[PDB]
Amino acid sequence: ETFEKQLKDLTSNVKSIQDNLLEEIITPNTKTEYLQRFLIDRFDKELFKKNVPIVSYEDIKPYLDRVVNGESSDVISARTITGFLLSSGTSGGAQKMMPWNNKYLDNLTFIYDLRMQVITKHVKGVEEGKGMMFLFTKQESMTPSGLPARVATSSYFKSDYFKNRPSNWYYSYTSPDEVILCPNNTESLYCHLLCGLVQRDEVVRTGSIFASVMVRAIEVLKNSWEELCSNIRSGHLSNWVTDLGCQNSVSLVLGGPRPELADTIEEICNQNSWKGIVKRLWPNTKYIETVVTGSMGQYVPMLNYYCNDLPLVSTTYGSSETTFGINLDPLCKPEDVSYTFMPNMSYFEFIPMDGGDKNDVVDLEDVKLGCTYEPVVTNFAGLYRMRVGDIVLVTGFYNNAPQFKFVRRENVVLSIDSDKTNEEDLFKAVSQAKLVLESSGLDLKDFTSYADTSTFPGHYVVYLEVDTQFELDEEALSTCCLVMEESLDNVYKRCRFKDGSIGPLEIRVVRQGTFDSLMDFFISQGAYKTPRCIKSGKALQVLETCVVAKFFSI
């Protein structure tokens, strides 16, 4: 009742909700130093549109730095900045810091409740069970202001919005809160699975924010099931888990020896093939809740294999700037997933990214079917007309609310997990290898790359065509791998050296003429610059036939 109406109101009243939101945002902010600069002295949409510049992160980083260093929030926001969000996006190798306050949590939990309703409208059999949700709290990074920088969901978990969350199936997990709150994710992932297994009959949903993490959970399961079952059998958690909260809370889940349940799970895990393993271990699971769009699409085949084509439900599109909105057709196929922006989240504008829309910038209500755009965000934390760097495509309309397929993050050439390595990053990394090559009597002719997920964990593959005896200097080429990795950003390093979600960077040295042949291949397809990443399977086949040596970082 209330919900059908709530969604009707949100999606029919788009222009006026957006315009009221803008006014709500701008009015108290006229006296901030940032807006004073552009003479926004009263609210007026036309003046905001004429005088407030559309900016990139780098344009306004100087203002952000000052707040990070302890200066008054009102440099940019009359609503007090009480923390920051650590973006997966980076600047000079360091994670971007976006301003944050409780409004972010009000939006987030609003979105959680809305999508909960969307899911329950379309999926039956969930209200009595729990979810085995692979949820992780990360470590924060203190800023000189005394305000912490956290990743988005951690800013939620480390708050009473989470601790005092609603008491219903959607917020009920097989893992104790202590597990979710444990900053050691090697330990918390292990515990997630153990708790999941002990309470396997109650599991009606499983998932994680992103598909990569769901895949890693299953792979870790495949690598740990013997140990997990030993804990279940004895009723004791392995000694190696150090986190006191995990020890205490998981001890209670376990309760005592469960040899019989251990036998049951071992029998399942001992089968010939891991196919359908998630459904076999968790037979009451109704769906998998995880983002399968953007670069996460690469994990869809693996997920279907492990999950016996249980529905993959991809609910939410969001960022460090703002949550955007949700998938109002949760049971659609991963390739047809679009996200309906919610007009109460932030004020949204769009920069056309093809010829289909000749305007310079357009409101949410005005985006055209079939056109791509870059979202531009004005939020409740001191970001005004901020370009987001994602490309989206309008695929439809729910009432008056446009629905958007996520196309890509612009410039990104390599992404396995949370890492997002852009073309510039790659060029820098390759540049370091070049120095190594020069220092060993070689030079680099050309290069390209590829995100390999054919094995776990996934890793970056870089093809190098070198030029000047019986053998390649393996020490030098190994060193090339190392310097490339070392030039990458903190997010890659965390995944690689702490999460183990990314494996050693691999260099594949290719034969003389490889990249000339590559060029021949592409122009035979119709076509020039060597692409900096390859996503065509045929081109990839061409490269592979050219490989003469393989090296790995470490």
Ligand X SMILES: Nc1ncnc2c1ncn2[C@@H]1O[C@H](COP(=O)(O)O)[C@@H](O)[C@H]1O
Residue ranges of the binding site: 87-88, 112-115, 293, 316, 320, 339, 390, 409
Stretch that binds ligand X, among 121-129, 183-191, 310-318, 462-470 (CB under 6 A): 310-318
| Known binding residues for salicylate | 112-115
Residue 175 tokens, joined = 């893992």
Please state, as a whole number, how many other Cβ atoms lie within 10 Å of the Cβ of residue 242: 10
Q: How far apart are CA 255 and CA 248, in angstroms?
A: 11
Q: Contact with ligand X (CB under 6 A): which of 11, 188, 320, 501? A: 320
Q: Contact with ligand X (CB under 6 A): which of 409, 434, 496, 508? A: 409
Vertex 476 angle, CA 518 and 419, to 5°: 65
Residue 43 tokens, joined = 């609210």
Using the structure block, give the residue that is written with the tokens 């692409």.
531
Q: Does 501 bind ligand X (CB under 6 A)?
A: no
**What track of x and - describes contact with ligand X for positions 36 through 75 (by CB under 6 A)?**
----------------------------------------
Q: Contact with ligand X (CB under 6 A): which of 203, 278, 281, 291? A: 291
Q: Does 390 bind ligand X (CB under 6 A)?
A: yes
Among 84, 73, 78, 77, smallest CA distance to 382 is for 77
**What track of x and - describes contact with ligand X for positions 135 through 164 (by CB under 6 A)?**
-----------------x------------
Q: Does 87 bind ligand X (CB under 6 A)?
A: yes
Q: Which amino acid does the sequence have at 363?
A: D
Region for 308 from its dihedrals, namely left if φ exceeds 0, alpha if ψ lies in -120 to 50, beta otherwise: left
For 315, list phi and psi in degrees, rounded to 5: -95, -40
Q: Within the chain, how many helices (H) and strands (E) appear?
A: 20, 23
Q: Does 89 bind ligand X (CB under 6 A)?
A: yes
Q: Contact with ligand X (CB under 6 A): which of 63, 406, 447, 515? A: 406
How many residues touch ligand X under the rule CB under 6 A: the total is 16
Query: Minimum Å distance from CB 326 to ligand X?
Result: 9
> Smaller CB distance to ligand X: residue 293 or 344?
293
Q: Does 448 bind ligand X (CB under 6 A)?
A: no
Query: Minimum Å distance from CB 317 to ligand X?
Result: 4
| Known binding residues for AMP | 87-88, 293, 316, 320, 339, 390, 409
Query: Minimum Å distance from CB 49 to ligand X?
Result: 24
> 421 with 414: CB under 8 angstroms?
yes
> Smaller CB distance to ligand X: residue 73 or 87?
87
Q: Contact with ligand X (CB under 6 A): which of 18, 174, 249, 319? A: 319
Q: Does 317 bind ligand X (CB under 6 A)?
A: yes
Stretch that binds ligand X, among 17-25, 266-274, 311-319, 366-374 (CB under 6 A): 311-319
> Smaller CB distance to ligand X: residue 145 or 320?
320
> Smaller CB distance to ligand X: residue 231 or 319?
319
Q: Contact with ligand X (CB under 6 A): which of 29, 77, 88, 145? A: 88
**Which residue in the shown chain puts its C-beta closest to ligand X?**
294
Q: How far apart are CA 366 and CA 371, in angstroms?
A: 11
Among 394, 403, 494, 416, smallest CA distance to 210 is for 416
Q: How far apart are CA 477 and CA 475, in angstroms?
A: 6
Q: Does 388 bind ligand X (CB under 6 A)?
A: yes
Residue partners of 355: CB distance under 8 A and separation at least 6: none
Q: Does 294 bind ligand X (CB under 6 A)?
A: yes
> Smaller CB distance to ligand X: residue 157 or 406?
406
> Smaller CB distance to ligand X: residue 32 or 293?
293
Buried b (16+ CB within 10 A) or exposed e, 91-112: eeeebbbbbbbebbbebbbebb
Cα 408–chain centre separation: 12
E strand or H helix at 318, and its extent?
strand 316-318
User: Would you call 126 helix, strand, or coil by DSSP?
Assistant: coil
> 129 with 284: CB under 8 angstroms?
yes
Burial of 280 (0-12, 13-18, 19+ CB in 10 A): middle
Stretch that binds ligand X, among 66-74, 87-95, 187-195, 473-481 (CB under 6 A): 87-95
Vertex 386 angle, CA 340 and 428, to 5°: 105
Q: What residues make contact with ligand X under the rule CB under 6 A?
A: 87-89, 152, 291, 293-294, 316-320, 388, 390, 406, 409
